[PDB]
Amino acid sequence: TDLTDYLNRHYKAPRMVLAAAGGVEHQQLLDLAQKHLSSVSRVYEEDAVPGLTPCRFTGSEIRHRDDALPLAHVAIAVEGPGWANPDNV
Amino acid sequence: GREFGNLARIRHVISYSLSPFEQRAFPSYFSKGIPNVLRRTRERILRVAPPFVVVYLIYTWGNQEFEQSKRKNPAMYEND
Ligand SMILES: CCCCCCCCCCCCCCCCCC(=O)OC[C@H](COP(=O)(O)OCCN)OC(=O)CCCCCCCCCCCCCCCCC
Prior knowledge:
This is part of a larger assembly, with chains A and B.
Chain A: H1 2-10, H2 26-36, E1 60-65
Chain B: E1 13-18, H1 29-69
């Protein structure tokens, strides 16, 4: 039932892209999407729309010490700009 | 010979820390500082204080005994 609720909540048609690359015709793919992929859900069934929430970045540290391992892996990061900010480039 | 890297063998221990710019320097300073200081002083006061208490008693007794040692004895100059 948790899987059914997740499937009915997050597999909405406006949040879906049917992408094709290579030897495909766009009109044939559009006709096939009209034939098969039409009317997925389009409705959240309770007018309960989820919203994306910003995430707080925290300068912090986690150290998992286990001296029996032969090699050590260390990652150091700072906050990134996001997808839509052009200075990513 | 004795530096970071070869001090001890530690397995399966996870440490979590945060930036000093992320947290307060005085997080509930008085409201948790007062009971912690009270707990430390009530765990150590019976071991520490009674020697200094009897030093105070010995000091006062010695000073007053020296003061009455300098006091004139009235038993003298009584026969004549
Ligand atoms: C029998 C203990 C009964 C304790 C009752 C109190 C309640 C206990 C239960 C509730 C908890 C309260 C808080 C507890 C704090 C830590 C625990 C504690 O205080 O334990 C008692 C402490 C240690 O006990 P312990 O070392 O086993 O006793 C041997 C005594 N020699 O022992 C003490 O603090 C006693 C210290 C006595 C020191 C007397 C010193 C006299 C002589 C001083 C001479 C100084 C120099 C004089 C001049 C010399 C030259 C002329």
